[PDB]
Subunit: 307 residues, 5 copies
């Protein structure tokens, strides 16, 4: 098995589409291996640009096709370069732009911690024909930066493993294990924008739904409650596009449900206060003085639901 | 007829666009057949990468073009590999990303049960020239997983049939039957997000439209009703993008119509209560105590309409 | 002029974008003509797959390029096949996905009746060099089906005509007429979704604007009217994306204008009622009992405007 | 300099994206020039289809590359045809779909008058090597039609000029002037849709903000004013997508600002009326009878701002 | 090292997508270098069009591939031209359309000052093999113009530097420095549209939240406050699409937060006024006369937050 030394330089990461859980990676890949010696004009290495590598591959030069496992379709490969040496070593440099998909878990949407994963693998040659010796990733352009809403922390973790494929077991009996390179970049989401745009007004409206009971009239308090519920409906569609449809509830959705439940609890308390008048002449004092105990109970509810 | 053994490995399914009823499938296809023996350098099989298969096809190697029947346009084929053996067998491996369309029935939108269908067929060679022996599908990557909002249940059902085409009957008199492979993956939609985001507040507003009659003033009750109807209008456009335009009504649309009908019934009951005053001095008691019978009747209506 | 027999098989029609009046057609085309006899290996026809036709065209085989007149740019041609016979006949089969544009008239938006038109023409050879003998269209996949919101009725009408081009008259003096094939598929829109989603609540709000006059207070009736007008504004943007900007008014837009006019007429009637008090002590009876004549007049207005 | 006679046939114009000021043009181009005589099989001209012109260009046939100056990127060229004659004349016919950008001035958005400009130029050969003799444009398909919201008036004006480029002056000392063809098609926007959808309800709400002062209560008049201002906010986002962000104000934006200013003037007049009570017992008559002078002044304001 | 003289002509800049911080640049590039002398037919230079350069590169002509560092994927290169001279100089002209990304800082969103940066670099040849002598940029088409919402000021600054790459240090020990060209075009955003569309109504609503205290009733003042807060919620989604999610607050977002805080301060002041009644018979005068001091304090707050 020929040994290939890979080096990935991550130029930038952007386009983090949290809806489809794909992110765009732009960068360069430098694969390097050693082959049989060849005659090169002069005592200098020979550089072969793009759309000129095809003549060398047609003549019979062994250039492996390294694909990305977790890419969406095909990467938009820009330029490629093949640098050949007289002693036998080959260096294949290429530039890639790819849409990569990783399993993202948005259980804590604003304070999220994800990792961007690049999985690289030979498409044809298995570990008995191609072995990845080492990979070192130079993510120095975005080592400690803020790309769009994500802080990149530290360096990029690298791993080299062997993947056994069962769909190639019927066509290749024993030799179906492929050498795979995994590159993980840990990123934390910047929670500032959601903190001052999607959490603070929701807290203000929750406190307003707390304050609806300070009136002394039933029907005007009801129209107040319904205008508040229309405002919670307004944030229902103001905050719908920022996240996909997940079975669990994040903090934003928990606060939206908290607003709905607070308005419904207010309406039920008003109705029971109207029903509490046994003869229609007795007023309400204790059930109308819940303007301070309901904030305490709802603060306890929020403290449970956030953690 | 040469016998071709196909093996499809579904790497991932995503991008389930319920509006156009297309889904994106990424995976690999391994077709395998047996041809006439050829001389290969050494006692090892020969691997031909992408854009090098074209030289073999120009020299005269028989490589069938397997197309997808239900694909949108053309798949974004990435790498392809042709592995040739001295005893005569040929293995064509390829990677595909495709937008596939299937007839989806959204009569039960949140609790939906669909199936993703891959239909594969030779474009040129009929069943007298190319016969699919068997297909076994390894959907092990997504065998029991949750891709975006869908649970994949069990394995993938496979079927091999013969399709008779009438447009090729005029050009091919008797031999126009094509061997087709059908792969069906049964998926169930995760109904959680719609349950806590699109159903529960609609139930709260339906109960609120029940509770509008607890006031003792006509005009303020009317403005309450109109603010509620504006809120139902707010969910009219808050829930419009999640589903195409279908002749039938799903649960979400049935609840939206239920909210509209409940507000209109409330307005008609208020107006008939105002019309019930024969001399303008008699009040309303029975028609104003419908705050409990109307919930019962509307619960019966909802129990009928959901089932 | 060589005679070409065309056969179009419409696999599916979808993506009917009423805004730009384009629709996506997926299908197959089978052109067939007769040429000079050639020697074929064996006593069987020879099948040439895609990217292998180019060698035959370079060697000198006459394969006409049939283009689509009403296509948006270029179709996404998938596979193509060229089947050659020893007696001389050539059959060119191809698969196309195209965005086609037709002049659509949305004067009756929900109850619309459009036709999808495929116009096919040789790009280079005129009627003195290429003549279309006949076309028969097998739209059996969607003969009587519901694609997205359209019922396809009957079979597909076909026509063969000759088009004289004036831009080629300066370069070709007399021979500039091209044989054209036109295929028309008549489709009717399913009006159910707009009936229970875009028409019924508008009728309910029109009846509500009828019912605004049942109050006995001027200012609360005014705020009722303004909340209703805000609801009509809510349907202004709830129903804006479903149709392009046309000079005429459809039923949905006529009902939106009806709602605006009904609210404005209500406001003017309230203001004239306030102005009708000559001394400020006389009340209003006839102008305040218009809660039944205004529905009759507006029903007559709607009966005129729908038809 | 060889003389080239160009003829552009505009099949259709569509996709007028007023946000980015680009429009899609579909059509055909017929360039014609005269070269050295050549031997052609028979006494008939020879027609060379697409992907067969490349062999003639490789053999040494002079085919100029006419590019579009104001195109977005590259046009989607469909088929191309090269018709060669024995006497020496060459006719290059091609089909183009292009996104073209022109400097559009939306100072009068509904009653706009724009022009669609096609600028054609040789990419390599200057006026000393290639001269455009004449261009005549056959826009007969859309001569007097309504494409999407635009009326096309008259024929297409054509012009042939010489452009001197300063970036090629350093590489070409004196010969850097290129022959350019400019085609201008004057179009007027259909203002009907904006008239009955974006102007009339704004006038109704302006008249409603005029009518807010007919009440006799301060606070209810204030909530009336705030509901009206919320409605003007509703048209703020109902009419935001139809036009880009321009420094100047169009009629729609002037009416939106008129609505905002009318509501603010109403609020200030109410507040000054509340402040006009010196002892709290004197009422307001003149400042409360501004329900007719304010319409006159605002009509004068609108008459100034529209013109 | 061969010396290359580059000249970039910026035809237009458009599509400034502030969300992803990319802008589209259309233009031409003219690289020029001097090579070994060659024999050309006649005493005139030879012009090689697009898809004919490939034959010269296959024969062995040295044409460097200049890539754009900050481009999104690959530019849509249109035509290219290679002009060869008998004395040895080569001129490579090309047209590019590219999506370029630069680090944009939107701390002052309407009054923003950005710079569009074009970074050009050889993909293969380092500074010991390729050196950029000089670049002069002719941005005369957009020297002093308004493209979409940006004024371009002055000329384009140019710089030539050397970049040392650490990912190529392992494969190239000492010679890994690349000659880079940087072109910066300073642009200022036109702040007019945001001034009369996104700032002025926010100021009017802030003044309205100032004016809410002029009433003498608690509950109606509360519903007034809640309708105002619903209007601020309406601008929450009316102004969400114009800018990405940034950790800091711009002027528009600061005014939105100012509106939220003003409504919440109004609600707290009303509640404390209701709580200030010790026995329920004493009224409020000083806390109800804050209709003038609160504007002064909020004007001071706004004067601090804008600067």
């Amino acid at each position: 098995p020929v040994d290939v030394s890979v080096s990935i330089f991550i130029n930038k990461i952007y386009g983090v589409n949290t809806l489809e859980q794909t992110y765009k990676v732009d960068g360069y890949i430098v694969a390097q291996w050693t082959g049989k010696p060849r005659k090169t004009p002069g005592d200098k290495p020979l550089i072969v640009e793009n759309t000129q590598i095809e003549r060398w591959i047609n003549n019979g030069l062994w250039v492996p096709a390294l694909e990305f496992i977790n890419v969406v379709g095909s990467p938009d490969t820009g330029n490629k370069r093949l640098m050949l040496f007289p002693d036998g070593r080959v260096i294949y440099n290429a530039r890639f732009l790819g849409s990569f998909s990783n399993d993202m878990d948005f259980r804590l949407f604003p304070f999220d911690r994800q990792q961007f994963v690049l999985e690289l693998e030979p498409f044809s040659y298995n570990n008995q024909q191609l072995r990845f010796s080492d990979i070192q990733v130079y993510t120095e352009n975005i080592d400690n930066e803020e790309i769009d809403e994500w802080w990149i922390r530290g360096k990029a973790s690298t791993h080299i493993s062997d993947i056994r494929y069962d769909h190639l077991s019927s066509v290749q009996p024993n030799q179906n294990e492929f050498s795979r390179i995994t590159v993980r970049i840990d990123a934390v989401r910047n929670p500032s924008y959601y903190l001052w745009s999607f959490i603070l007004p929701l807290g203000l409206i929750i406190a307003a739904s707390w304050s609806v009971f300070w009136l002394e009239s039933f029907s005007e308090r009801l129209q107040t409650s319904f205008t508040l519920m229309l405002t919670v409906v307004a944030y229902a569609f103001y905050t719908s596009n920022i996240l996909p449809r997940l079975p669990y509830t994040t903090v934003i959705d928990q606060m939206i449900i908290a607003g709905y439940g607070s308005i419904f609890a207010a309406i039920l308390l008003i109705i029971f206060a109207h029903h509490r008048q046994a003869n229609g002449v007795e007023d309400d004092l204790l059930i109308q003085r819940c303007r301070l105990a309901f904030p305490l109970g709802f603060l306890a509810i929020g403290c449970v639901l956030v953690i």
